[PDB]
Amino acid sequence: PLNSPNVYDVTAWRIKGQPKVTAESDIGAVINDIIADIKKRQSTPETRPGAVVIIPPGDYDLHTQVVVDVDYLTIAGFGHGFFSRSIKDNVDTTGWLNLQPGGSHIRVLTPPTSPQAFLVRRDGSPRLSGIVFKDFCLDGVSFVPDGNSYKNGKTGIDVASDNDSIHITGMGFVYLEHALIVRGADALRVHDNMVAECGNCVELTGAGQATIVSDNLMGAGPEGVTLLAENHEGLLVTGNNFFPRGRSLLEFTGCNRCSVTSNRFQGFYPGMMRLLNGCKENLITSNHFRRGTEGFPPFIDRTNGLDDLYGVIHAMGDNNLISNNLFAYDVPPGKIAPAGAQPTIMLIAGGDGNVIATNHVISNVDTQHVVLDGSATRSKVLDSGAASTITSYSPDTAIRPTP
Amino acid sequence: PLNSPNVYDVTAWRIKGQPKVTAESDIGAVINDIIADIKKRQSTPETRPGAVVIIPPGDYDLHTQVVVDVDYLTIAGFGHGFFSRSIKDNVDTTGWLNLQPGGSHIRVLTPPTSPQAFLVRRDGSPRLSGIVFKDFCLDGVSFVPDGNSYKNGKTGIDVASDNDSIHITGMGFVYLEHALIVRGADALRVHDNMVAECGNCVELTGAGQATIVSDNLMGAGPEGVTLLAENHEGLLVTGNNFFPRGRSLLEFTGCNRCSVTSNRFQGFYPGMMRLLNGCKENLITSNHFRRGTEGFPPFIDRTNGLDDLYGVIHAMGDNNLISNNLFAYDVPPGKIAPAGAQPTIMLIAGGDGNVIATNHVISNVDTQHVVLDGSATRSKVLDSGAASTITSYSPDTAIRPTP
Amino acid sequence: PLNSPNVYDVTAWRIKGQPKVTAESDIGAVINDIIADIKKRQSTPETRPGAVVIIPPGDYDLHTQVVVDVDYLTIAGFGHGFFSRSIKDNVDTTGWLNLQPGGSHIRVLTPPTSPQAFLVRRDGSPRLSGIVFKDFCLDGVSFVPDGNSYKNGKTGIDVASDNDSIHITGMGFVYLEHALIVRGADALRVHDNMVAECGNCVELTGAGQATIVSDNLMGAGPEGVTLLAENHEGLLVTGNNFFPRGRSLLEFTGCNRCSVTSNRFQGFYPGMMRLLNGCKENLITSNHFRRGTEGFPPFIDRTNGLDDLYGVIHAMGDNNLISNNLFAYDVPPGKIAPAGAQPTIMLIAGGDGNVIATNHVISNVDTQHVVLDGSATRSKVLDSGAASTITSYSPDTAIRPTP
Numbered sequence A, B, C: 001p002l003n004s005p006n007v008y009d010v011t012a013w014r015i016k017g018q019p020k021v022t023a024e025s026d027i028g029a030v031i032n033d034i035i036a037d038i039k040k041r042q043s044t045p046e047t048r049p050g051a052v053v054i055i056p057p058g059d060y061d062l063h064t065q066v067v068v069d070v071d072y073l074t075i076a077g078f079g080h081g082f083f084s085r086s087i088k089d090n091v092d093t094t095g096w097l098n099l100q101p102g103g104s105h106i107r108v109l110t111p112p113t114s115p116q117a118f119l120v121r122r123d124g125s126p127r128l129s130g131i132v133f134k135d136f137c138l139d140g141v142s143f144v145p146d147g148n149s150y151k152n153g154k155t156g157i158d159v160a161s162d163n164d165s166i167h168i169t170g171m172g173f174v175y176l177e178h179a180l181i182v183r184g185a186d187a188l189r190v191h192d193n194m195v196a197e198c199g200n201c202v203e204l205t206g207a208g209q210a211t212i213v214s215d216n217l218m219g220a221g222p223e224g225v226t227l228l229a230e231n232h233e234g235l236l237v238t239g240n241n242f243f244p245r246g247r248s249l250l251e252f253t254g255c256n257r258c259s260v261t262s263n264r265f266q267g268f269y270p271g272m273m274r275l276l277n278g279c280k281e282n283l284i285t286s287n288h289f290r291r292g293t294e295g296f297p298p299f300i301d302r303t304n305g306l307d308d309l310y311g312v313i314h315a316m317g318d319n320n321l322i323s324n325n326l327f328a329y330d331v332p333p334g335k336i337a338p339a340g341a342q343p344t345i346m347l348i349a350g351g352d353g354n355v356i357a358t359n360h361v362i363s364n365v366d367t368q369h370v371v372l373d374g375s376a377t378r379s380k381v382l383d384s385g386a387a388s389t390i391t392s393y394s395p396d397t398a399i400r401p402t403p
């Protein structure tokens, strides 16, 4: 294609010993064979610059899990190819000119025992560095037992060992139980992706440092997470548009000195944002929160099992700044739980020195803008509602009502 | 070029029976012929993954409107090719080594009766999905009758039917009366583009959901819009650098539960930001606003027809949070209208529950930081100026002066 | 490769008369010859659309400085190839599967007479427009005399003449004394790059207009800047993750009406943010600041030579809004200078009308959240700590303590 052996076209690559295998029949086998070719040529610790695998637009079945265990591998298509399988699956498609995702289109047809389309993992040192996934579509094809389960055991990309400077951009993920998982992420960027109609969208697991999640469109399923981070330090979440219907839109557990800023959140259940298990010294600011109710008939009775006293934001930990957010709550009174309760917008479940400053709430019913658990200490609530919209069971919260 | 029939090089493609029609002579006609080839091969609703059209760097005339009516079409160049035709048209260009835009350079030379270079439109179902425009230049060549009119009747890209997951990134738009129009946008991303010296930059018309406009440079013309949204919900506008000389920099009509955060706004006219016709429950926070006067001599006398009492922000609607913004106003008294007027920074023209909080205003003359119309109800003004800079004609406004 | 003479593959280009020079032996010489070919063919101000130079993944030595003096030149690889040379240089690498950066890997071996790998410079007119650097690695190979100096007199990209609409995206910079320099930057976008283990990361010098620095991962050296801007107007710095160990993370000199919003800052020294020499009317908001101490043994005793009274933010200028930020200070008392001092979080070193509002500080020791110099005039401090945490040496500071 170019005059470098480090540039591969999946539609031009022949597997020696399996001449009839195509990118169309099993792109997984083609890419595994390409990776082996790279390893045979790049044979010393000073001769491993990596390579690019090009996926032209087309429909490709992946039956064999790809194991990515080389630094500086780029897998690149020409299009994210997103299509709403959810709407397709639940309406009359008579006369429809298209019935499936496209672009650089990988249909994920992995076996139950190696279900991740791409497994990014290396035993040995150093950390896998500078791997790039961009501009292609990962499509789980169907949910089981029906299209509305958000279950199929499939993952798009699973990074399973400690990693540095991975870049995921311009991707499409659809109808995967898990779109993207990154364990032990350092200096990761999940940037300008379409991640929707997946059980779970982006799971940043184990721990991490110096990560950016920015400019993504994300929508998960009622039993799954949209964005999850575990034990992240210095995670920055900005410019994302999170829409239904994950159990949560942003879920942090043991995350400290992180920032969630300049995002839009739309959710159909309580607990759209969760700072769990002691999240300390985080900035939660300049975000738009919309709590509404399900309007797509196939999901109207679905629930994440939480009631309206849980909070739009549910925070457990110390010294978070929750400031300059707008909350627009509109849930029919017959769909609030428990019956006749005032919904809670921000729940401080516990922790020391949390500050809630300059937040505007609109609700269709009487709501507590802020409830602070009795266990909360040295809390500040500034200009986040009149006295009658703030409930402190904690005896030492300083409250300045909105004048 | 690659071993896929879904990869087209506009410079390699020949129209059978029309050998003199090339990318150079009419790239419009070439791309229409490419799209006819896609439809010929991709002939069922399960065999339409789409294609990529590659535009090498070069100068290409477009005489024939391109009709994009296939999902997952990527039109991709190698460069946005932006050049200030405005400065070129108004100074001595003796010894200049370049006089026009470049990169993947499409010169829009459309007839008055099909004036849009790209018309993205499908009568039928489903919605056009996953179309990508990236890394090329759309150049309308000249404004008439001279370069300073911002008039030529040309559009760069017009999405005229309901769409899902379209991606516009790394583009250059110059000297078009309309750069980009997207009607009925769902999950649209307008990201990291150069949209400047156009009459209008980005018009998101009719309605839309779950859209992101991020990381763009935009400058329009005195009769046109920079960013317009009509009846959008959950529009996120973040990380953009809006400069002159649009009639406005951000104009919403009937937009609800949208967010404008972490942007730079510089304008030379009143009404830089307009929330019009009942915009409700929007977040306007962490933005920098600069109101100056025209410095470029050719435009010194140009105006958008509004006076300095219209507002830097003009808001008509309910329950908006306008907080944590800086306004730098510097207009010579000789250029203020009406003469001797105290300029208004934020005008609440009407509506219920609007909150103005923690805003810093610098002005070269005495200004009212906030003016609230007599019709405004349950308004809050906090820490947005001394008492002498806040004017409420509404009797129920709660005002805390800056200490 | 494509049917355009404006598309160049560095691995396929032969220098006439120098048949032994490959992209591997001296990519600098190959790219200079490509640029000579462009100038041969593109010889009038209406025939200069530019070109793309494609760098396949691989290891390339650059001995010869590239002079970029054409508009709309795109230099594009397929990967940023980042690798921590710093960790490699300071631990036992026995059994390591990789020992250097990769992707589209340019090893910068420039002589001291021409030390910048890419010099972007045109004497003549007009300003260089629309140049794109993307998706390749600039690697200075080693620091002098050892890995921990952050000195080698090498620069990755130096834009030395006035420029418009330059785009730097998806790059990797490692082990350069200066990664990226852009002088007289107009409508520049430094977007989604890895700029790390460089003495200095991004230097925006001389002056500039309408620039965006967004979505970058940056970490510099203790004698150098991470982001520097000189005399910038309307610079937007958003969505960046700045980590150690620059002397500073953000350093402005004479920058006015700029916005630093929605970033993450981690530093190991005082003066993480410096608004020097009359920075006025700047928005510093919705940022997370973490002041810690060095944990990486080779640097434990390295300092930027500043004491803890310098400030996490050091501000010399008028009418800045420093608002809605979180500061997490944790420095062992034995590492605070001078001994027994209260660290300063925000120092107003001088200037008129600065506003400090809605900032949350956590420290391990007694700290002054805000100190205002004797020279500070008409300062305002709101809800940024108790009265005992605010020091005004100035007699005219209006102070509202956190309730």
Ligand SMILES: OC[C@H]1O[C@@](CO)(OC[C@@]2(O[C@H]3O[C@H](CO)[C@@H](O)[C@H](O)[C@H]3O)O[C@H](CO)[C@@H](O)[C@@H]2O)[C@@H](O)[C@@H]1O
Binding pocket: A127, A162, A163, A164, A183, A184, A185, A186, A205, A206, A207, A208, A209, A231
């Ligand atoms: O994860 C970020 C980054 O840290 C490195 C070391 O610099 O890895 C540390 C590691 O562990 C941490 O997390 C585990 C589980 O919470 C905890 O037990 C340990 O004390 C922490 O240091 O992070 C991953 C993810 O859990 C682990 O595999 C690893 O031990 C680096 O390798 C990594 O990129």
Ligand SMILES: OC[C@H]1O[C@@](CO)(OC[C@@]2(O[C@H]3O[C@H](CO)[C@@H](O)[C@H](O)[C@H]3O)O[C@H](CO)[C@@H](O)[C@@H]2O)[C@@H](O)[C@@H]1O
Binding pocket: A084, A086, A087, A196, A197, A219, A220, A243, A244, A245, A295, A296, B164, B186, B187, B209, B210
């Ligand atoms: O709600 C988001 C969630 O639902 C999915 C379908 O399973 O998408 C629906 C959608 O929005 C609409 O919801 C209904 C269904 O058509 C409609 O009446 C309403 O007007 C829409 O807002 O979500 C996006 C916008 O957020 C639309 O493109 C789409 O119609 C699923 O994709 C998503 O995760």
Ligand SMILES: OC[C@H]1O[C@@](CO)(OC[C@@]2(O[C@H]3O[C@H](CO)[C@@H](O)[C@H](O)[C@H]3O)O[C@H](CO)[C@@H](O)[C@@H]2O)[C@@H](O)[C@@H]1O
Binding pocket: B084, B086, B087, B196, B197, B219, B220, B243, B244, B245, B294, B295, B296, C186, C187, C209, C210
């Ligand atoms: O206001 C931006 C608007 O003007 C255009 C030209 O039509 O930009 C011109 C530009 O520079 C010129 O004008 C400035 C003063 O406004 C003057 O200092 C300079 O000498 C002129 O060349 O204006 C900004 C402001 O400095 C510059 O970025 C730009 O070069 C147009 O592109 C834009 O929409």
Ligand SMILES: OC[C@H]1O[C@@](CO)(OC[C@@]2(O[C@H]3O[C@H](CO)[C@@H](O)[C@H](O)[C@H]3O)O[C@H](CO)[C@@H](O)[C@@H]2O)[C@@H](O)[C@@H]1O
Binding pocket: C127, C162, C163, C164, C183, C184, C185, C186, C205, C206, C207, C208, C209, C231
């Ligand atoms: O840099 C922004 C933009 O401005 C232009 C003119 O529109 O260049 C002006 C220029 O000078 C300015 O900065 C110098 C030094 O601070 C100052 O003396 C002068 O008064 C300013 O106008 O900016 C560069 C960088 O310093 C100079 O080379 C140039 O004279 C435009 O060319 C440039 O893109």
Ligand SMILES: OC[C@H]1O[C@@](CO)(OC[C@@]2(O[C@H]3O[C@H](CO)[C@@H](O)[C@H](O)[C@H]3O)O[C@H](CO)[C@@H](O)[C@@H]2O)[C@@H](O)[C@@H]1O
Binding pocket: A164, A186, A187, A209, A210, C084, C086, C087, C196, C197, C219, C220, C243, C244, C245, C295, C296
């Ligand atoms: O502090 C950032 C600075 O240090 C460099 C190496 O010179 O990177 C280190 C690194 O992180 C850590 O510091 C220690 C040593 O590894 C570790 O204990 C701690 O957990 C990390 O913070 O920086 C990034 C993230 O900040 C990690 O991937 C990396 O290990 C250098 O790259 C950087 O400029």
Ligand SMILES: OC[C@H]1O[C@@](CO)(OC[C@@]2(O[C@H]3O[C@H](CO)[C@@H](O)[C@H](O)[C@H]3O)O[C@H](CO)[C@@H](O)[C@@H]2O)[C@@H](O)[C@@H]1O
Binding pocket: C306, C307, C308, C309, C310, C311, C344, C348, C349, C371, C372, C373, C374, C375, C393
């Ligand atoms: O600029 C801060 C930097 O300067 C040092 C001295 O090297 O601190 C001096 C200090 O105080 C003096 O500053 C002002 C006069 O401008 C006045 O408040 C005081 O009386 C002076 O003696 O500067 C700040 C106030 O601006 C004080 O906290 C500090 O003591 C150095 O320690 C510091 O890093």
